[PDB]
Design an enzyme around this catalytic site. Sequence first.
Site, PDB file in Angstrom:
ATOM      1  CG  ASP A  10      -1.626   1.331   1.564  1.00  0.00           C
ATOM      2  OD1 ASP A  10      -1.952   2.084   0.612  1.00  0.00           O
ATOM      3  OD2 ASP A  10      -1.859   1.610   2.758  1.00  0.00           O
ATOM      4  CE  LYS A  71      -1.472   7.297  -3.535  1.00  0.00           C
ATOM      5  NZ  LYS A  71      -1.877   6.283  -2.529  1.00  0.00           N
ATOM      6  CD  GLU A 175      -4.609   3.824  -2.588  1.00  0.00           C
ATOM      7  OE1 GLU A 175      -5.328   4.658  -1.995  1.00  0.00           O
ATOM      8  OE2 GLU A 175      -3.482   4.102  -3.052  1.00  0.00           O
ATOM      9  CG  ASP A 199      -8.951   5.295   2.098  1.00  0.00           C
ATOM     10  OD1 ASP A 199      -8.455   5.476   3.235  1.00  0.00           O
ATOM     11  OD2 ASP A 199      -8.272   4.962   1.096  1.00  0.00           O
TER      12      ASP A 199
END
Length: 385
Positions: A10, A71, A175, A199
């Site tokens: 992850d 990211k 994800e 999330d």
Amino acid sequence: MAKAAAIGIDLGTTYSCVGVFQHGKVEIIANDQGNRTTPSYVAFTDTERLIGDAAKNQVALNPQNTVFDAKRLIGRKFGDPVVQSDMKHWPFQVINDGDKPKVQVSYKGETKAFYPEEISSMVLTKMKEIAEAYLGYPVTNAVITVPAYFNDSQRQATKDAGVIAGLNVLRIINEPTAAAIAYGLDRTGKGERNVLIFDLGGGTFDVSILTIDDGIFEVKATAGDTHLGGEDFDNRLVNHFVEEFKRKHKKDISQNKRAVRRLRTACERAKRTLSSSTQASLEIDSLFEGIDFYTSITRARFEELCSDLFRSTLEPVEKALRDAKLDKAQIHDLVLVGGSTRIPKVQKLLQDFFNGRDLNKSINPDEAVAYGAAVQAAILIKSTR
Ligand SMILES: Nc1ncnc2c1nc(Cl)n2[C@@H]1O[C@H](CO)[C@@H](O)[C@H]1O
């Protein structure tokens, strides 16, 4: 041996996690400091390059040469309004190299510039070495996860980060799909299954709706806030304690960078305690001008401080349901992802919005994505033989 082994990674915005599926169970691998998640930070110092916890621990002392949020840049063009907007908030330099952003730093006394994929490859290398130290042999096959809204360019740059890191990338998976795999939601037999993944991480909030028809995954909707997460809740605690210090001592601490950072780290710790206790204590020796700050806060006051932020997480849930063209009762499963979903008020708001429904939360929410990736990596490496 090693060729028959595969890991699940992850690769998060603020934290990364690595898992391995062996002997019928997933093992989330602890780093050398015993932590099951590692900060996605890379520090460049006068003597060395630091990755993870060691990089996060010296961020105050070296802010210009400590890279994080790579990211947010990966697979993007320098001119992208997302890049231009984010650059105004980072203490490190971002430069343009033929419409591609590079992070520019001082390393061993020299000016060096890195592509976001080179920065992410350093985080991936650390995750790979954490797995190798646990397993006793080098593991090179990996499943790497990405947000469901990542386009082809962002997915390709993530795969390139994996190649630079010495990993054989079996697949780049979404994800929310890794999270639904963790809960075995693709093994319920026949018939379409609607899953909502909530999330809430350290710096981002994502809501995803998936349909699982006979093992096949389909993304119906993605919604959220790329600038909402756990760190906004820490900052609300920080502002409260700055105002409390001012009432008790008639002194403004906000300008003292060291005092604000020590208060910030203590607030983050107190926030975590508030997920399992109805009160948390702050114990800061000589916070400002030799004054100790020994205080406490209830979960009730913390919930008041973040009330508007917790409530705001329900607008993307509604937006995702309308985009997916589904009513609440049409959602079969609710999955929690991200450390911030451990907050009892967040769970209560989501459960009440879904009319008292049970939440899938038995897997550590900051580990569920790596868990599912590890399951998929085991299935994929077995099919390869
Ligand atoms: N017990 C907890 N109660 C509240 N927030 C938590 C908790 N654990 C983590 Cl991690 N977080 C936060 O999750 C983010 C990383 O996923 C960070 O903001 C961390 O503080």
